[PDB]
Amino acid sequence: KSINHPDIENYIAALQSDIANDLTMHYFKPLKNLPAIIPQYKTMTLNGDKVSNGIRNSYIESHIPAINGLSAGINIAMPNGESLFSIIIYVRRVINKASYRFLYETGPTIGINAKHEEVCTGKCPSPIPHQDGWVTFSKERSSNWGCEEWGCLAINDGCLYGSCQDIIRPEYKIYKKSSIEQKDVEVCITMAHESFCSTVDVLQPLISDRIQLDIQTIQMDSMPNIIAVKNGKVYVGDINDLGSTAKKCGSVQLYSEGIIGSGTPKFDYVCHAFNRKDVILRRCFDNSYQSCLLLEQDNTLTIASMEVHKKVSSVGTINYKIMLGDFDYNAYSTQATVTIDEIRCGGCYGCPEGMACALKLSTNTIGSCSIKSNCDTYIKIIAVDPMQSEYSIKLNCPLATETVSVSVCSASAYTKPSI
Amino acid sequence: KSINHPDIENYIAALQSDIANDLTMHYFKPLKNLPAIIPQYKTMTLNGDKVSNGIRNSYIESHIPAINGLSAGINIAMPNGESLFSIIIYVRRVINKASYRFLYETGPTIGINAKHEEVCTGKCPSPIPHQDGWVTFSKERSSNWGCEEWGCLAINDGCLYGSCQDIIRPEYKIYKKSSIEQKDVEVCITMAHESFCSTVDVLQPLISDRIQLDIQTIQMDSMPNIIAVKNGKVYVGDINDLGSTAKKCGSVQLYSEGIIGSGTPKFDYVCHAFNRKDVILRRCFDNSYQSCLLLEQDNTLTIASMEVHKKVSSVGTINYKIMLGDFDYNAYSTQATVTIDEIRCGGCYGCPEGMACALKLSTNTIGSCSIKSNCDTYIKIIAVDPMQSEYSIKLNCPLATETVSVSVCSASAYTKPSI
Amino acid sequence: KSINHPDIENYIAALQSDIANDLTMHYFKPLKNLPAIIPQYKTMTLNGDKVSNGIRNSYIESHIPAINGLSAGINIAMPNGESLFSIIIYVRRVINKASYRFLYETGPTIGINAKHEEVCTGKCPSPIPHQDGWVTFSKERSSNWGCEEWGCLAINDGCLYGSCQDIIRPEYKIYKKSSIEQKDVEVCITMAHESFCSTVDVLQPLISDRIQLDIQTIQMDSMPNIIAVKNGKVYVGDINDLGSTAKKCGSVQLYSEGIIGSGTPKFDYVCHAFNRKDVILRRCFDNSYQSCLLLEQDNTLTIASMEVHKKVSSVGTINYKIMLGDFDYNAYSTQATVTIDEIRCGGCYGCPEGMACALKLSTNTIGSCSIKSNCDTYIKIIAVDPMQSEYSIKLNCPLATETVSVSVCSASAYTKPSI
Numbered sequence A, B, C: 001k002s003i004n005h006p007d008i009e010n011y012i013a014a015l016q017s018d019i020a021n022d023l024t025m026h027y028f029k030p031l032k033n034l035p036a037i038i039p040q041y042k043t044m045t046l047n048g049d050k051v052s053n054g055i056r057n058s059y060i061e062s063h064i065p066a067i068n069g070l071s072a073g074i075n076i077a078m079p080n081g082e083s084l085f086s087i088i089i090y091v092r093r094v095i096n097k098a099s100y101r102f103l104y105e106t107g108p109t110i111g112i113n114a115k116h117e118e119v120c121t122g123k124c125p126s127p128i129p130h131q132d133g134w135v136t137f138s139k140e141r142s143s144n145w146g147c148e149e150w151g152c153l154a155i156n157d158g159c160l161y162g163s164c165q166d167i168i169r170p171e172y173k174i175y176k177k178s179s180i181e182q183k184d185v186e187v188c189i190t191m192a193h194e195s196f197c198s199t200v201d202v203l204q205p206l207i208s209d210r211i212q213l214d215i216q217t218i219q220m221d222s223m224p225n226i227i228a229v230k231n232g233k234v235y236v237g238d239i240n241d242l243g244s245t246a247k248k249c250g251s252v253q254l255y256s257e258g259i260i261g262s263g264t265p266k267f268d269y270v271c272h273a274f275n276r277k278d279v280i281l282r283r284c285f286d287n288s289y290q291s292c293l294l295l296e297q298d299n300t301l302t303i304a305s306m307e308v309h310k311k312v313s314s315v316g317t318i319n320y321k322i323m324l325g326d327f328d329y330n331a332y333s334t335q336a337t338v339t340i341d342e343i344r345c346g347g348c349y350g351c352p353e354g355m356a357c358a359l360k361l362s363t364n365t366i367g368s369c370s371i372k373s374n375c376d377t378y379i380k381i382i383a384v385d386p387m388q389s390e391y392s393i394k395l396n397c398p399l400a401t402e403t404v405s406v407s408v409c410s411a412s413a414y415t416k417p418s419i
């Protein structure tokens, strides 16, 4: 009837338009057609106000963990009056990430490249001649009766020497962290069928007229210094840096300029009465590739591409304050509806991959859930997503385990492990 | 006289009963007969209210570090009126923990299991025969005049070969972390002779009608990946993972399926004119057990049982809000009364155990104290407990140290180190 | 005219005097003649009050990251009235630090100290005689025709043995962490030409009548366990602990009591018909010093002196509350004016030092800036200081890089790398 006295519909439309325009003018990005976002988180709130002339301007302040997928609800209502609409504070993305650089490939030794010579008289040359990266071997006093090349009559004299380098079958690629790690956090104001989002970092709070948000955090040091990569999966553990040949994964290293390895060749020889000796070479470098096979896959790490991303729980706290005018505000939340539609587990006890479980999950909302098991877990919370159905986790189950149980939010499921 | 006009006694009894019932109905656990809890912590508070009809409903909000043993006091008073009672927010437990799994035992080499054979003619067999886990050794051309088994006349021919594996005396057990680490935090509402407690984690704030609490935190990565255990004590440092034989602690590994070691045996032999050669074996594997002796004990780690617990300082912040009705609220605290009843220190400078001190402490309260020394310390704060009298700490004191001084809260003590 | 009705000048002087006296009486330290401090940080604020009789006493509460150099502004104004003065909350210092202790020196092998003997008859002695820390070598059956010392006629008998220890040229000094690490945080109340400062730690908030501050934090584990030091610079990576001789940096260790190394000497000998054999010794220990050359310098670490300091981003949150009486309060900030006056970069891609850049920066304020680059960086924020003009950073630039770009706060600069 009148713009003086608006009905509830146009009053709410006006308020949401005002918020949207404020956020957009302060560089929040509008996102549309997002999946369902039904807030799980509610904590205490602080409510306050100031009056200008005779008009009360009230606010609500609260905070939410900087946890991927988590959101909190605020209901907006007329003073001592009816509910109008909801504002959701939604932590749309939390990940840690760092750059990595390629160091070398490794794998088992499958052959030896070798060179050798012998001399009838004189002592072994100093040094033993060799290519860079090749290790040497030699024996003095190699000329003797019954053990002569053709035409040599020297006794307890001469030399047999050479050099060698392993040949490997490449199986793992090894990378080193080549940046500081950093948090990547995006937070959204979610209103009915529209969201307004922005990355947030610790030096620059998000400021609009009605809504302010900031992250409080602490520098993290969560990501591994060296990793090994096989078949798109990230392994961590006892891994040599480039140039180190300690007896652990990656003691033989194939990279752009050649191969690196060390060790004392297993070198001997067999005699002939009037022919060159045969070199018996049973090992060149030491190679501890079997250590690579025992590296543990870290399911929290994924290759983004080099760039690695780590799934993490909380990276801090998002504070927020909402001041719309003369309103009442209250927090709300709802437990998510999650079902574990299926669960398959296979693996073993004390093993590198432990007990690997594939879950199919249904959820009515983007959110974050507690994950529990009768086994030990390698995450405490898992982000759930209507647009993703398949989730995988790694478990550490005792040898005395006949059923694996897993719960996500309030959902439970069990399976007998697939051996 | 009247339930309309209650005296102070029954008014306070009613309010504390109302709180207790609220907390219990919202799944807080009632604890009784706890030791003295006299709060040490006070910071700024936020005070606020709303009136419904004509009744004011006021609150106080504040926060306290998630630190084991720490507590904060809130005094409840009539508006512009007398004090009624106190509510204490008490951080009853903070620890980090993770599961571990057994990898192997190690210790010094005390003998060699060995096998050997010789052949009169021919070259060394390929491969040298051996059991799994045994390393091999061989020498070609072992038959010669003056150096023959009975009936052999071969010259610069034949072979002497064998295999070996160390025997160790087990001294340390080595474990690997086999779960994510997690915080274990319990917080209590402490009123006169009754406490109401609950574990708290980051996804689920503690909600009752009158009192809300939450923890804000960040994922931690505080606990070691590999440890060595001797006599109930946890050591950390240069420790091989299972299957790695780098020259550091644990290069020889005794586990369920056998022993793991590597190296080039120190193998030679002595001749007889018409009898088998004697094998001289001065070393089989390399063994770097002396590195285990230099591992540092980490006094913050304890075996719970595998499960390890770590003592830590802050793991985050506990926020809390209290809204009882029409009251005034103010924070309070009191310095703890701590005495160092005795102190004994023994050790040395640059040593694995450093300077080890046993303290006997008295305290009038569960609490958390700053610990200081003229030496370097391995903790900055220590939890104090009326039910525990003995405390031990590790110090790093310079060679130029003749008296060790230590303070805990306001208490001081000194001793000459016991060498 | 009257002390009843003060002008604005003496009213502001009175209020600032009252604050200064309060802070000083509560053990804040007065600092004078500090560089310009113009606050960059503003987030949401909470405003509140209580009236006593008829006098309103109002407050403002907010928080600021515990970040070195950062500050936040609060403007103090008459109620519905004019601005009076400003209070700045200034995080004057944030660093992490720990003590370290000297382990050993290492560098390349440049010679071998050796001893040897031979015997005409008998087998090699058990053990081979040697000094502590020397490795042994021996060969049985060393006496033969054509290969005898003067007067020996033994055949396939006798022994040649000895011991050896590397000589190195010292290049790096290796230290181990010998304390817990700790935060060192100082915060100031900054008013016109005077600041009031105090260290703050998590157990003890800073309390005065008008202003309270606290730090909320979490235990950090940011600093390396072992480091290598060369020319005042700190290197981190694959570094042996004292007594460990794995094939990585520091496998040969010179310390107070001697040298530590391990390995199988490359030992052989040459014959004479009637003179002692010549010992050919081509290597004693294994030495993996070339690994030290590939260690990465960590520019966030500096030697304070042993004591090491680490530059870090946020270590937590500083909360603060200001209550002066009947005032209005509002937050404010200003973007810093920073210029990159020059930038020089030199280095290479995949290299230990990466791409090293020296910057000359101008700034109108102590502050904290975001640092960005087209290359990868090893810090995300950098503290800027009017009293410091030279800043250096390390970059990880791809082989496909022809111009290095760097921004600090809003300033940008680029250079072609100096190769």
Ligand SMILES: [Cl-]
Pocket: A126, A127, A128, A136, C282
């Ligand atoms: Cl050589």
Ligand SMILES: [Cl-]
Pocket: A202, A217, A218, A219, A220, C313, C314
């Ligand atoms: Cl940070």
Ligand SMILES: [Cl-]
Pocket: A246, A247, A248, B246, B248, C246, C247, C248
């Ligand atoms: Cl190693």
Ligand SMILES: [Cl-]
Pocket: A299, A300, A378, A379, A392, A393, A394
């Ligand atoms: Cl997982």
Ligand SMILES: [Cl-]
Pocket: A282, B126, B127, B128, B136
């Ligand atoms: Cl073989």
Ligand SMILES: [Cl-]
Pocket: none
């Ligand atoms: Cl002969």
Ligand SMILES: [Cl-]
Pocket: A313, A314, B202, B217, B218, B219, B220
């Ligand atoms: Cl967390």
Ligand SMILES: [Cl-]
Pocket: A245, A246, A247, B245, B246, B247, C245, C246, C247
């Ligand atoms: Cl090694």
Ligand SMILES: [Cl-]
Pocket: B299, B300, B378, B379, B392, B393, B394
């Ligand atoms: Cl300790």
Ligand SMILES: [Cl-]
Pocket: B282, C126, C127, C128, C136
């Ligand atoms: Cl020996």
Ligand SMILES: [Cl-]
Pocket: B313, B314, C202, C217, C218, C219, C220
């Ligand atoms: Cl802490």
Ligand SMILES: [Cl-]
Pocket: C299, C300, C378, C379, C392, C393, C394
């Ligand atoms: Cl840097």
Ligand SMILES: [K+]
Pocket: A145
């Ligand atoms: K002959």
Ligand SMILES: [K+]
Pocket: B145
């Ligand atoms: K003969």
Ligand SMILES: [K+]
Pocket: C145
């Ligand atoms: K002869």
Ligand code: NA
Pocket: A027
């Ligand atoms: Na912008």
